[PDB]
Design a protein around this ligand. Sequence first.
Ligand SMILES: Cc1ncc(C[n+]2c([C@@H](O)CCC(=O)O)sc(CCOP(=O)(O)OP(=O)(O)O)c2C)c(N)n1
Ligand SMILES: Cc1ncc(C[n+]2c([C@@H](O)CCC(=O)O)sc(CCOP(=O)(O)OP(=O)(O)O)c2C)c(N)n1
Ligand SMILES: Cc1ncc(C[n+]2c([C@@H](O)CCC(=O)O)sc(CCOP(=O)(O)OP(=O)(O)O)c2C)c(N)n1
Ligand SMILES: Cc1ncc(C[n+]2c([C@@H](O)CCC(=O)O)sc(CCOP(=O)(O)OP(=O)(O)O)c2C)c(N)n1
Ligand SMILES: [Mg+2]
Ligand SMILES: [Mg+2]
Ligand SMILES: [Mg+2]
Lengths: 556, 556, 556
Amino acid sequence: MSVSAFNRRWAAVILEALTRHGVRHICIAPGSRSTPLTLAAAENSAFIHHTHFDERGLGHLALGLAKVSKQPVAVIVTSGTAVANLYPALIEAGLTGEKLILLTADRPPELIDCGANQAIRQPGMFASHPTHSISLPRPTQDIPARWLVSTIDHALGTLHAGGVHINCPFAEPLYGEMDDTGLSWQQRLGDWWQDDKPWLREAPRLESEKQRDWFFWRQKRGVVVAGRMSAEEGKKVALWAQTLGWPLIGDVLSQTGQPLPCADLWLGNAKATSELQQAQIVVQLGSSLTGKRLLQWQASCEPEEYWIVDDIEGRLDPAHHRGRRLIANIADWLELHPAEKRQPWCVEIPRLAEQAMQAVIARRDAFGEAQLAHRICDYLPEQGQLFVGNSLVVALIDALSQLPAGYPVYSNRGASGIDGLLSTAAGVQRASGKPTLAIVGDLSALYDLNALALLRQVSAPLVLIVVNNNGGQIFSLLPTPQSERERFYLMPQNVHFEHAAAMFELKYHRPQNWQELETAFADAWRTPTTTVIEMVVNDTDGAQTLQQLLAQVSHL
Amino acid sequence: MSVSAFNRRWAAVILEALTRHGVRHICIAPGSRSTPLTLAAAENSAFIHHTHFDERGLGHLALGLAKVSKQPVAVIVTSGTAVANLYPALIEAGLTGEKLILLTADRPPELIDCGANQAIRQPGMFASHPTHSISLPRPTQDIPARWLVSTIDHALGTLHAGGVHINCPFAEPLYGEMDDTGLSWQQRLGDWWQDDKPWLREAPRLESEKQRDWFFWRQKRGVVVAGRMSAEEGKKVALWAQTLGWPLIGDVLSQTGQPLPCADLWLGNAKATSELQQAQIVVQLGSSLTGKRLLQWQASCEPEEYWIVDDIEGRLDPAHHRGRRLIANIADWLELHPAEKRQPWCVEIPRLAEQAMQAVIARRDAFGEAQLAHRICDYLPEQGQLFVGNSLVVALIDALSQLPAGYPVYSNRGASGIDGLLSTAAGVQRASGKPTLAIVGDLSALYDLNALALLRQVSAPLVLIVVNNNGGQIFSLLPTPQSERERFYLMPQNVHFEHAAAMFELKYHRPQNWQELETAFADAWRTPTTTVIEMVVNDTDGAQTLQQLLAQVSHL
Amino acid sequence: MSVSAFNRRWAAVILEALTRHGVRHICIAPGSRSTPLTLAAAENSAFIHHTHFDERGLGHLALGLAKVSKQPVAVIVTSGTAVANLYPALIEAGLTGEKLILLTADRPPELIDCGANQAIRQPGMFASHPTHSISLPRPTQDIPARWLVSTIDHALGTLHAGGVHINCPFAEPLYGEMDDTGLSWQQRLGDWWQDDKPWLREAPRLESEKQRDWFFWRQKRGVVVAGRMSAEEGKKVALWAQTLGWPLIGDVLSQTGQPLPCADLWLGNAKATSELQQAQIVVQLGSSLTGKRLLQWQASCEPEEYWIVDDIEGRLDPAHHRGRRLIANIADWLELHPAEKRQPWCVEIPRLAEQAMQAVIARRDAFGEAQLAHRICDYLPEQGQLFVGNSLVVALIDALSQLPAGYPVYSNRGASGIDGLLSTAAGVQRASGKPTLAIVGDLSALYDLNALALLRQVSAPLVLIVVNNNGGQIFSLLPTPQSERERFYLMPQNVHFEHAAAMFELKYHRPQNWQELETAFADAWRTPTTTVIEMVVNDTDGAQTLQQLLAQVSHL
Ligand SMILES: Cc1ncc(C[n+]2c([C@@H](O)CCC(=O)O)sc(CCOP(=O)(O)OP(=O)(O)O)c2C)c(N)n1
Ligand SMILES: Cc1ncc(C[n+]2c([C@@H](O)CCC(=O)O)sc(CCOP(=O)(O)OP(=O)(O)O)c2C)c(N)n1
Ligand SMILES: Cc1ncc(C[n+]2c([C@@H](O)CCC(=O)O)sc(CCOP(=O)(O)OP(=O)(O)O)c2C)c(N)n1
Ligand SMILES: Cc1ncc(C[n+]2c([C@@H](O)CCC(=O)O)sc(CCOP(=O)(O)OP(=O)(O)O)c2C)c(N)n1
Ligand SMILES: [Mg+2]
Ligand SMILES: [Mg+2]
Ligand SMILES: [Mg+2]
């Protein structure tokens, strides 16, 4: 009657069940109460194990792994505030669809609400942000293993997207030699242990039907808006929009190649919006649109119908247009609603976008963050991936650069948090095995500073650009009041990142001009290690350059 | 600007939006805070309005209406315990899939938690039981009508099954002359007001893929179990199982024609269960299986695979078998997995089912509830429908009768409450316009006694049989302790229902023999009115007859 | 190792624990899953057991018992919608403070969300309305009895007011002979089984401190508003306000004797409100004020300070005055803040109130509901109690009658539901053993009609007056729209209650004049039984009479 042994048999059923749904990566933070889960995971040869000491960073690491691999990723944490630190990544996964399976160890019910150490009320603590929530009961042999495996199989099988909170209480003793307690209990599952399928297969698909009046609407004056999607989906959307003869507005997160680049500029020109007013239908594929001018135009346009195609559920139009919400894999939906060659109807916008790109190129020389964003395509690693941070970097790349079609971009643009970008980038890199360029701001790098520990383990060179503009200079772009701006918005920390890099034995460069930045990159791509490149720029130059380019393109 | 007028335009957008998703029936209870909703509904010509003073019965009325019409049915109640009385019907709909749209008037936020009369905390008060929960904000023109209609359209469009809780706060004044306040706000919706589709079309379908190994499994020794489903699905399932040569165990709710009747009896015979041990796959269509012996066999059986096909989501096997949970329209699923003619493999069970039926036929003469259940087909109205109550009646009919294939049966077998059976039957009748036979126990009739008011308005004859065995005699069938049984289980109320019928001006019969029962029926089918037939039987005769028949068939 | 016997030991600990906190009354509805609780209660000699088949009426019966006895009252229900039917009485308990302990049987965790019959998600289903919620775990001897009893003792000891939800899962088998399973487990509590105290005494008192500036505020022009309170508290508040010389506005629920009667009438006079504008402080004792003119004056008045003294927590002023919210026993609070002799400062209001009462007396002769309310003091049983229903009756009694000081008045005026007035009145009666006068409207009587079953067992004569004006004529009182009024507001049911009384074998009178009403009362007070007195009055006479008296008193 060993309680510790049965705890580990119970946990073993949980972990093995996860392996039947494609869970390969598991992220583990240290703890005692989580011993059954952690030991079950450590003995299971199906898993790739990642570890970290910061549970918030651990959640974001799993988020990067799931983001890139598109598979579900498991997380194990002990009870207490460890569980609470998983909330940010769980919320982001709830918005962008990553499947995070959170195995959160818990105290047994008899140690809740009685002043016990490290014991908190854990069931339901993530409210509505998980797609599925499971509060497992106190382990007992009187509950059959087929129930437990069926519960996990239901949770994973019906998971369209988002996280699953599985709260796992365990009573002490937690340690001891394994005996035969729970062995026959496990063996009631028969040769399921030697199988590769779930015990219960419940995998219904959620998908919109094909639109039968599509061959009617494809004949009208349409606009294609491309948001976040996969790289191949970006290429397919570009070819499809070109065949329809519809203008393609491509987000930085779309890998379209942006045939009409610098939309965040030329959408501010009245000639562009006036021409767009002729559109009778807008077909948007993907969501989480980046550029402000694009969100303003989306809010202002009044086509007869507005369609949003995406594999995310729920409403995705923040302007609440009359139209359609269509849940589908974008590539499959494009096969279901194919294009037919038709003459382009736009005449003024292509010239406007060409002139906008020219206006940016004329200002490429100064050694600032706006020029860095504009020139970032010259620095993308061959056969690599781009992880773009939040705040100004993603806005400037979206507004000022033309990224190549099908070159993968990853981001945390659900909630756009600055709290997990380094640990997320580590997961992005570890998932794909590709050389990675990640670009973040100074406050973002400080926020997840300890994630530099994770970046000591990458499988290919990862360049982390930290743009140091001494604060959150997006609040120099926003019309924040000047008298409170410094103390309450920008919050400069007056630091550099050479000692942070030295602390974790990472190569570091602080280039002062373009030649030295190119030298730094040429060095950094030579080894499967993380190199930190700090670009020190004058605080408000990027914001002001963006404003000036906006005005200049508006008078075209 | 007029607050009362704008409140009514806000409500009018809500109700009009509901009409774009098939909402036709609307159930209304009286109140003051619900005035914007109730007046908007009264002015909208798309609705059939039903009224009732008991909100618990009003919810069950909406439940029966939705049950029969297969469309979402709306409910309007004022704030306070009126909302709370909707909980039972909402729970049952959450289990069996009826789409109840609950429009619950509320006090505005400034009158919550301050001692205001009839003001309670309403958002989230139904916990996880609604499929969707919408807590509308305090009405204001600063929120566009397109947002409101889009929120409703998202909720109804993605509603696969179950209830939607829409909390609707309204601030006073509620009354006053209608002026043009909010007219422009409404007109931002354009010609949507003259349209017949939603403002936002968001209607993804949830369905399992085709099982690609079905051509293997169809040739193995299978068993077909038919649970609750529609009448036409019942006929298709019967034909499908017959073609496969698999034994069909048909529930009273399956309308399959029950080709192996009295399963609750012959499943107690060791030769049957021994023959079923040879089954390699069980394919169950529908759920909420009725009989105790059937649930025990399901719990004990160990096929290689156990499948449950149904249009309800989630796990439906209370024994957690290894197998599959397939979400589909059953007719579509049968076409997707067609049968191929193979010879039947069962030898002993058909004979056992015939002999069991004969054993019931031998005891048909006594004027008791077991005989009424066994003989109930002789009282089914032509082109009518059967509504069967809970406790002993559904068990005795399931065990003792063979109901004709395709003859519609309705019930409340999700949670199996005895709290709303009369009002549910009233909704069933009003939705179909068909002559109805409804059968309930005495405690069930007392529980929903005031629903006799609703049964003063039927569009076709409805016979209500109240089996009066003086208490809940299911607790004479279960091995309840003898010393506490009467006071704490049976709870006989020692009443008759003649004065209940007279209070609501309903025809009444208390037949003493079969001939007088026939006479009561013949009188009852002649006009579109409700006739109450009270059948007085000795308390434990039906339970004992069931026990004796179980033993006798077990010794065959 | 008997699961059934241990279920009953676990339950026996729960019920015995409740007896240490003053739980004497227990209300039990029938079921199978509730067997451990029901048998534990049936075997425990500390309890008085009440039974009922309608769980909503069972909740209101417990509500009335707790209302009168000021003890916590326990309720046992089976799993499923039975649990949901307790919601209205629980909400009312959350508003007015009755201590209801809801013991709700549940299926064990392995039968949740898997299609099992009568199994729903019960933990948290009452949202925020219980003061304390306990989700008991699956019973096991690995959890010590001292944990179980300590958790119950914590919930009951810290219960200031309101309901407690104790969810109690039990796995089958539920029946079987008691053996020694769980005996030593129970015996770990030692001689606590022979004790009269809780295992854990945790009973912190919640109370506001003495107001140090009260001797300052006693000398200002104050008004005393008396809301709902106990009978003794009403008498003390009357003497206190008289000693201060402050006008006492006394609610129908205050039992103050209403020295300025017909406040709902004379508060409509400009001289009264103009005089009251001189008030620099208002001290309200109790809450849930009844009358519309009183609520309007509270909303409009702007004293320097507004105090509400009550033993209920939270804000109790729906008008949000600047001031104090003082939590205390009213009698204790009067002793901490005693009155000093001061000269009344009001001159116009006493005369106005005498004139209003005279104006009502001038209209006492017609045989209508307004006149019944005005004259109701002539029918109060000696040493008895009054239970006043909702809608017009409580408003007409409040506006037109002067009830004697200290004569007990009971009501359901938290949420003011019409859904449990009969069963509540039965509990009010059984708790005190006093002769009871209960007055309700026709829709109220229909709503809780089956509670007439409960009224077959009263310990003293109870007169139930049903005022039948054929609908909810309070909506003839409010300015509802004329063409929708009857169908969507009044909803007349066109019934009488002679057959309802006859069905439950209750004496019935339908008096046609004051003499026959007198005779009916004399007949009713002779035996400890319920007599139903139906007063048929013309639909709008009571409402209209009130409006006329309001206009006339407003113009004095
Ligand atoms: C946010 C969160 N997440 C995880 C833990 C777990 N947890 C601990 C217990 O407090 C508890 C065990 C347990 O029950 O799991 S201690 C501990 C290690 C601390 O390492 P250190 O700073 O180098 O100090 P040292 O161990 O003395 O060398 C962890 C990692 C936690 N407490 N809080
Ligand atoms: C976890 C969390 N908490 C706070 C924020 C807010 N927030 C931002 C928007 O999101 C701002 C809109 C908004 O806040 O409504 S941006 C921003 C500054 C980032 O500074 P940086 O890295 O130095 O880069 P820079 O701006 O380019 O110079 C902050 C701090 C956040 N995103 N996530
Ligand atoms: C609203 C609610 N609350 C309680 C129950 C429980 N419950 C039953 C099971 O359904 C459940 C068992 C169980 O307790 O496990 S049956 C039953 C008695 C039925 O009395 P009847 O109408 O005269 O019919 P008869 O028994 O054939 O004579 C009760 C009272 C319920 N179902 N619904
Ligand atoms: C459970 C629930 N659901 C609905 C309501 C709404 N509601 C009322 C509240 O607005 C008034 C509460 C009060 O303040 O007294 S009053 C009322 C009509 C009652 O008709 P009646 O018994 O014939 O008496 P009469 O009006 O004097 O003729 C209704 C149907 C409710 N209170 N509770
Ligand atoms: Mg910065
Ligand atoms: Mg019965
Ligand atoms: Mg009335």
